[PDB]
């Protein structure tokens, strides 16, 4: 089973992030899941579509 029920493409600035978890395909979920743990303790799922998240993965070699 996947962790995300919804996904947002909105830009989350560095100042509001605690951690970004990247979950690839498999382990119960067919899609790639990008989970953002915010400083305000809320957990936000981000669309692997968003340009800002694409630019980040592109550099995370």
């Amino acid at each position: 089973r996947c962790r995300c029920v919804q996904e947002s493409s909105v830009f989350i600035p560095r100042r509001f992030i605690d951690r970004i978890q990247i979950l690839p395909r498999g382990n119960g979920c067919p899609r790639k899941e990008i989970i953002v743990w915010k400083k305000n303790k809320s957990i936000v799922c981000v669309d692997p579509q968003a340009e800002w998240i694409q630019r980040m993965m592109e550099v995370l070699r």
Partner: antibody
């Protein structure tokens, strides 16, 4: 050799502008943020502003809004700091500094600190 | 301008342990663990000693330690030696999304 190489010493007249360069050597700007900090002779460290080159997002300290423009070219890993309307108080050493990340199997963790500092740039204002 | 409060000077004999306080407000130091410490030698660039209240980057000696209680953060230098004779600055991020530095502390080793 994983460092931030800054442009040379500058001597400027009061009222003129100064553009300081900060090039990453032995690394890239990556997902890191780059901040600009200054230090007047015999005085303390003062955060001017910062930029996240990967998104082009820039923030400035209240005191420096309108006087300072901070830019970055991610393709060459070079960051710039332009300070206008120079005066006696602007005579200082200008440093660029990296705000790094921490990564595990648990994820990406941003670090609000300056781990890599440039050698500094001396900017002298004549009068 | 709205700098964090640090004692101007802290001194002790060689081999002693010293503590440097850094007082801010609920908006900065008091708001989160985004508090770091810097060592600066005369005519040199600052160096990161501590990040995230008490974390040490690679190369920084176990002699340097950090802690935070309320609106006050602290740096502890144990086994004080002549190489520790420098200026010390605390830093914090703010809810006004800026960084703010402490006024600085000159650490002297007494003879």
């Amino acid at each position: 050799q994983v460092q931030l190489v800054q442009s040379g010493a500058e001597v400027k007249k009061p009222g003129s502008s100064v553009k300081v360069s900060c090039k990453a050597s032995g690394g890239t700007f990556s997902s890191y943020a780059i901040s600009w900090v200054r230090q007047a002779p015999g005085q303390g460290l003062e955060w001017m502003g910062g930029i996240i080159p990967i998104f082009g997002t820039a923030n400035y300290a209240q005191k420096f809004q309108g006087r300072v423009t901070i830019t970055a070219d991610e393709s060459t890993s070079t960051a710039y700091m332009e300070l206008s309307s120079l005066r006696s108080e602007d005579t200082a050493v200008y440093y660029c500094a990296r705000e790094p990340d921490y990564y595990d199997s648990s994820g990406y963790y941003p670090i609000d600190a300056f781990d890599i500092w440039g050698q500094g740039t001396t900017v002298t204002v004549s009068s | 301008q709205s700098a964090l409060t640090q004692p101007a000077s802290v001194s002790a004999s060689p081999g002693q342990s010293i503590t440097i306080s850094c007082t801010g407000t609920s908006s900065d130091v008091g708001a989160y663990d985004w508090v770091s410490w810097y060592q600066q030698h005369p005519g040199k660039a600052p160096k990161l000693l501590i990040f995230d209240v008490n974390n040490r980057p690679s190369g920084v000696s176990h002699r340097f330690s950090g802690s935070k209680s309320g609106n006050t953060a602290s740096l502890t230098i144990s086994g004080l030696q002549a190489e520790d004779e420098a200026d010390y600055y605390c830093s914090s991020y703010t809810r006004r999304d800026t960084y703010v530095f402490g006024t600085g502390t000159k650490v002297t080793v007494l003879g």
